[PDB]
Amino acid sequence: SSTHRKFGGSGGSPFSGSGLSSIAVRSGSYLDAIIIDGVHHGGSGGNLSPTFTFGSGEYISNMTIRSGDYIDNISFETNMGRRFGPYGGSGGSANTLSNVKVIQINGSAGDYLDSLDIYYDN
Ligand SMILES: [Cl-]
């Protein structure tokens, strides 16, 4: 296999997302945490989003991340046309993974979400 792309900065401690079955975030001006399959990655600040639960073979087909030294914003669309976000702030540069299949979301987090490493098929 896959392509991957890293977003964000160097802080935090690494994590792996595991199978992409459900996602929620905590955000304010930037990302406090991402919660993947009920597992928390990041801090306790900001506001907690609703949980997006993927339906049977649903996957992320478009994803937009705004980031700088931290992850500032996340949004995505799925192959079924469902949407998540945006959650976070303006700030950072924006980048979109367009018409892909996201297979893993790994990253690094502490009290905030420092970085994401997105693995995807083009
Ligand atoms: Cl930042």
Side-chain angles (χ1 to χ4, degrees), residues 2-122:
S2 76
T3 301
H4 67 115
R5 177 94 176 268
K6 184 187 179 194
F7 302 84
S10 71
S13 283
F15 70 84
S16 299
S18 200
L20 295 172
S21 297
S22 62
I23 298 171
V25 295
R26 299 192 72 91
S27 64
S29 294
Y30 37 66
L31 274 169
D32 298 89
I34 189 166
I35 306 166
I36 301 170
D37 301 341
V39 183
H40 198 99
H41 305 293
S44 69
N47 302 129
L48 181 59
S49 73
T51 297
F52 185 102
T53 300
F54 289 81
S56 290
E58 194 177 24
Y59 60 85
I60 299 167
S61 59
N62 284 292
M63 190 167 78
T64 296
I65 293 172
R66 296 191 58 170
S67 61
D69 215 14
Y70 291 76
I71 304 300
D72 302 315
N73 199 295
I74 296 174
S75 65
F76 66 75
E77 179 202 36
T78 73
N79 68 314
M80 299 293 92
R82 298 200 308 150
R83 302 185 173 278
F84 181 79
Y87 292 112
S90 62
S93 302
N95 291 288
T96 301
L97 300 175
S98 294
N99 315 126
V100 296
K101 174 171 194 272
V102 175
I103 65 177
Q104 297 189 5
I105 299 173
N106 304 320
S108 190
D111 41 10
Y112 302 88
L113 184 57
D114 300 82
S115 63
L116 293 168
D117 196 358
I118 310 298
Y119 291 72
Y120 63 95
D121 301 321
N122 43 202

